Amino acid sequence: MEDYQAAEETAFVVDEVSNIVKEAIESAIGGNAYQHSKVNQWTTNVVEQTLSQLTKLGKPFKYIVTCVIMQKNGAGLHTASSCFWDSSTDGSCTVRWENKTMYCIVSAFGLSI
Amino acid sequence: MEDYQAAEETAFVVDEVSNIVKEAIESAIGGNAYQHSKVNQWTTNVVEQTLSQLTKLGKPFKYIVTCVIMQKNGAGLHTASSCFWDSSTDGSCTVRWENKTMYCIVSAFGLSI
Amino acid sequence: TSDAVTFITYVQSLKRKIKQFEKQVELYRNGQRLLEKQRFQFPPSWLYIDNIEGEWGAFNDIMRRKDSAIQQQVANLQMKIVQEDRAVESRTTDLLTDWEKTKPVTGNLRPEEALQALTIYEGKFGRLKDDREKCAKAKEALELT
Amino acid sequence: MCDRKAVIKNADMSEEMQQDSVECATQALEKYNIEKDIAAHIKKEFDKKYNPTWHCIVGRNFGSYVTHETKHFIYFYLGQVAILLFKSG
Amino acid sequence: MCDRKAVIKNADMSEEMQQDSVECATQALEKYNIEKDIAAHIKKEFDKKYNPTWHCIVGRNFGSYVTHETKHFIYFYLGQVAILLFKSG
């Protein structure tokens, strides 16, 4: 039973990272409409909030956060990522959010040290 | 002299990552224009050549590479990636290519194993 | 996709009408010809014939270009309906077992509390019946599976 | 007023904008004599009215095949002048 | 090949792009006898090669005033035939 708890503590849990990404996006973006000037600020706040929450987890994971924020003008959006690590320990989480006028795709990767 | 050569062999060289990403992008898409139905295949190609040729390097690095493809219709472009690793051994390289109607940004991160 | 395949059925129901309307246009494209050789003063708000004929040809071409195409790629929808009805059958068997276990036919149980229990069972059983009937109706509407 | 009856030879349109096209093309033909300038006047006036951008041609011997925005394409005849106008962009 | 000298009046696009237009327009004129089919050919092959949306006008007399994106405008003569090809979409 102790081994399972230790593994859960040391594993890259996907849903927790997804909720972290949701909290970061909601705090930095919220319901504000897309504006070219505020895009950089939104991206920086999202990435830093996600990184801070991932570090606060205490898990021995190097964290990589990438954020894309998008004006809705009928253009199709696709983000893909195929990567090599040790699938037993390291993990990835790509999450998509959207409102009336904006897309937001955030990818967080946790690699065991 | 031997120590410097070994360090260069085990280092994450940004220039060769930029070259390898450019070669993968050019082989996968090249002069082809933007097509929404083919974005999936173009991203899959770009990523698989990138990962295969990065693995062919032989460096002891876990590789995480992400490709984003865009139609040119006035929409904004940005890629923000802040990460937490050991800067002395782990590296990142973001390559942005553009043609008459399409943007392709590929970000490759190499982390020491 | 149910609604979607519903509209798919809808578009088949339109096909005949299309032909119908088409031949009407054919009849029309004859009568209006008389119109110019009977020296008709065509009104301004009168939409002129070639306009509608061009846009109707465009209509027919776009419909037969895209609706058919989206119709062939239905194998994913077919397998989705297959797994959906499989889950429906699994839930039906589970509800059968629940009913066999739940039989309150004994008189010791309080009629009101057992009545509420049977009401919860009937609510979820009506939900199961709705799921089964909607799966069946989607299957027969798509009619390829 | 010279009654140049309009024969609209194709349209993916509403009727009110078609009749606006007919009336203003008649006005331009009454006002100017250069086919390029007729098309120019009509193109600016619709660009002002129903928001850019259109493309207008005025002439006698010309054939066209273009792609337009839905509900924004007309082609008609006034007198001996064929006038095409389609919105694309 | 009848050397129909492409005297080119207006041009906002590159010279290789000009020459592609001229070659395939000779192709369209030598292949087709209807100016509408010539314009359809040229617009379609420009849509295939230089991406939508193109607009080709083939005629002997006409007045054109259109808005085109930069680097995408040609208006030249093959023999007496005026050809206007521009991208807008």
Side-chain angles (χ1 to χ4, degrees), chain E residues 46-66:
Chain E
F46 261 62
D47 285 336
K48 187 181 175 190
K49 194 174 184 189
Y50 308 108
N51 319 128
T53 300
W54 292 97
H55 314 275
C56 189
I57 296 180
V58 174
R60 301 185 187 196
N61 70 312
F62 62 90
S64 62
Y65 182 76
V66 300

Side-chain angles (χ1 to χ4, degrees), chain B residues 33 39 102 105:
Chain B
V39 183
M102 183 278 288
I105 299 188

